[PDB]
DNA sequence: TTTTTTTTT
């Protein structure tokens, strides 16, 4: 719904071009920015603030749904699978949308074959009723290799131009261009309204590290983070994506654990762990999700991505 | 691209002089150091931070490239040949440019006789329409043997003189100049744009064991190290040069174990161990790789590098 | 090269006083040890560091030189012969300077043989131009016997009072003691500025073994080894001279297996076997050298050394 | 919230 139904509500025409100067585009918009968001970052009066927020309730509904009637409002959700079946019966059917799953591995288990994995399996059709589309891919450790996905794409039978052409790409340099990209990114998702389908961000602390080190910076480094991993969650419901992101490791001595704190383990919806077995298999484990059990499986990270 | 290209945008001149004194000579300088850096250790204001970061956006762009699109900017990308026809087979053609190849061996398996083949195998025409140019060599141990370089150059036919001139070589004391001295790598790449290929450092953790022994000290050891990787990442694409990088090991009670924890291991792109075999024959094996995948073969350290 | 250069730089004189209570003598002293190990073991402000880091600055250089204008710096290492002519060519002329020549051996093999005709080969002139000078013997196990070198110097025809008057020695009696003698050889090689040229230790871990017993203790013993050798190496650089050391020897079940780690094993440059033949010859294998390859000798221990 | 070290007989 786009953000021209408010004019009509008295609304000036002006004030629909300062809203899209701060990045709002949609209704939904509206309804996830507060009103200190609005009055203290552009500078209007504060009758100028209800007016448009008196104006988004004459839309999508203020109240309450019971359980029964929300949960055919939850059809729309989808799941991207993965490359191999014991895999997507850990997820309960792969890669959900309308979440962050996030996936941490110690140091060569798979995590970039994974997110290669992904930029092929999404563009498939496959189980119900999911079509695919295009795909953007964040990255921050420089490993993201064009002619890696041809490998795969001759495994899933697709030709080599419709591959590449569906798949955007852009480097992050610093932590400050982590926060700048994800306005191009929720422009891209506005204009082709309803084509892309997974935001896939390589490892989004492999920044952090650096520019935050010691421990008079750990406070500012955890309120930077914050207030990136909240954007991700309401892109992800603002137009109906799937968001994966891969995670470093730190030893512990008092035996692993993952870099981020409390912060990133709250925000995440489900966590996996790769871990390194017989040779050139590796094995995947659930610590945390909603409604799936913790379990494990076996890969196979084979010269056309991730198999069985 | 030079700097001069923003007191155009009516930036002072005066900026000019005051960012090159921080070590900020070309616009790629500016897109990877943060708002923090030059707002809090610079003698600059707020108001005087965005107006050349707002000149920096009237140049290269902000925004999304496809992955066909950029496939074709990864063509820049060289491969620098090891000496031997088994070991490029491995690497996929040699030591990769934009990325941090890591070489980590026991006791005797070659390691400084692999950088001395490539302080002469960077200097000649090869695969891929490669020319070859001058070489960097950061010592950490006191091994470099000029008079060994001249046995490896009467086996590619190369005369005396031109081998030694074209290589530079400065001595590491301690771990401060290991930091140090990559101000005058950058200032070098800077001068003579597109002359220098290759950046080989020595043992990069042959001066952190003993500078930062204990538990006590082994939180700013592993902070000390991420701010130098993140360095040597950045230069390794801001002028478009290769990074070869020896590695120790320790043991392991609880069977060896490189030294350096997951920051090391993590930030390198390429992981290579060596061990000993048949005599004068090593065993050269990959563990991490974004793409090729493992394998194992064999060398010949013999008295003119590494051969077959 | 004294440290009375940065006094006519501003610095205060008591500044010059502090800096030898600590054993900085050298303007290279100060290039070898850390900001950390003068800030926090003195005791003194910042501000106080940098002022004597500047002053260091104006001195020998900081940069890059060729490889060909290093090959000629490279000249003043020197090359002390060990008594036999097949010994010397598998070491390329003798023992190096600037360097850490290592020979373990099992049980008789002859290295307090070999550490005894050191202190005579090493005061007569040679090849190259070698001066020859006096000599430093650290002790371990008490097996210095001063008229065993009487028996040496009838066989290079040299009169009794000049060879014992040129020979320092101190016997370490504990593991604390290898580290404080250090001191004074530093001290001592500062005072005649060129007249030494050796310096002898018996076998380094015969202290280590005893003091350290255990599994609990093994992280102690390596970290309080590491220590050691970087300063034996500083040492031999700072003052250009050559590093002897004996090693022992314990089995392998699962053969021989010298004592000391990876950390000994990296550390030292030139790795000499010496095992028994028939009768009293010896057999000398290298192990590990930048430039010399694995070959194979015969000693003969005599009644006047070590000869052929 | 951050960060792994180190062989013996
Ligand atoms: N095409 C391929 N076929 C088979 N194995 C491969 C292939 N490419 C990479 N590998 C293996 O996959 C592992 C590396 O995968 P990768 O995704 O890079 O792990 P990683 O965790 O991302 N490395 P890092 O970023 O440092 O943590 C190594 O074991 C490689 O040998
Ligand atoms: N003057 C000499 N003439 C001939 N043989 C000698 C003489 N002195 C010692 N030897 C022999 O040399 C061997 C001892 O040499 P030595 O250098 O002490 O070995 P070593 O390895 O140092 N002993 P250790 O320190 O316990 O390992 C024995 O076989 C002696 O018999
Ligand atoms: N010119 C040469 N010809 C043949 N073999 C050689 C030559 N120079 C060295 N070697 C051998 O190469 C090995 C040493 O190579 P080197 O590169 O020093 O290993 P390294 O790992 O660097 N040693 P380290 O630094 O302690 O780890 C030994 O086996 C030597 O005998
Ligand atoms: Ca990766
Ligand atoms: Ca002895």
Do not use: W
């Not at 419709?162 to 204009?191: G, I, P, W």
């Not at 409390?262 to 040779?279: E, V, Y």
Request: charged share 25%; glycine share 8%; with cysteine.
């Amino acid at each position: 719904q786009d953000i021209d139904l408010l004019q009509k509500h008295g609304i000036n025409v002006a004030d629909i071009k300062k809203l899209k100067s701060v990045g709002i585009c949609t209704i939904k918009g509206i309804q996830m920015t507060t009103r200190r968001a609005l009055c203290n970052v552009k500078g209007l009066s504060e009758a100028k603030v209800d007016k448009i927020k008196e104006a988004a309730n004459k839309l999508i509904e203020p109240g309450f749904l019971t359980a029964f009637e929300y949960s055919e409002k939850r059809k729309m959700v989808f799941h991207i699978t993965t490359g191999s079946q014991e895999f997507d019966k850990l997820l309960g059917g792969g890669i959900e949308s309308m979440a962050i799953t996030e996936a941490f591995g110690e140091f060569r288990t798979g995590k970039t074959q994974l997110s290669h994995t992904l930029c092929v399996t999404a563009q498939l059709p496959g189980a119900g009723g999911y079509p695919g589309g295009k795909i953007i891919f964040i990255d921050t450790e420089n490993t993201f290799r064009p002619d890696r996905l041809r490998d795969i794409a001759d495994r899933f039978n697709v030709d080599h131009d419709a591959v590449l052409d569906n798949v955007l790409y852009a480097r992050a340099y610093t932590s400050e261009h982590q926060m700048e990209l994800l306005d191009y990114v929720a422009a891209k998702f506005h204009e082709e309204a309803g084509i892309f389908k997974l935001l896939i961000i390589d490892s989004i602390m492999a920044l952090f590290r650096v520019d935050f080190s010691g421990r008079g910076e750990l406070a500012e480094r955890q309120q930077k983070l914050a207030q990136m991993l909240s954007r991700l969650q309401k892109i992800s419901e603002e137009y109906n994506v799937a968001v994966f992101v891969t995670n470093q490791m730190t030893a512990d001595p008092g035996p692993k654990k993952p870099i981020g704190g409390h912060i990133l383990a709250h925000a995440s919806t489900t966590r996996i762990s790769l871990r390194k077995g017989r040779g050139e298999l590796r094995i995947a484990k659930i610590y945390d999700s909603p409604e799936m059990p913790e379990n494990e499986a076996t890969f196979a990270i084979t010269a056309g991505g991730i198999g069985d």
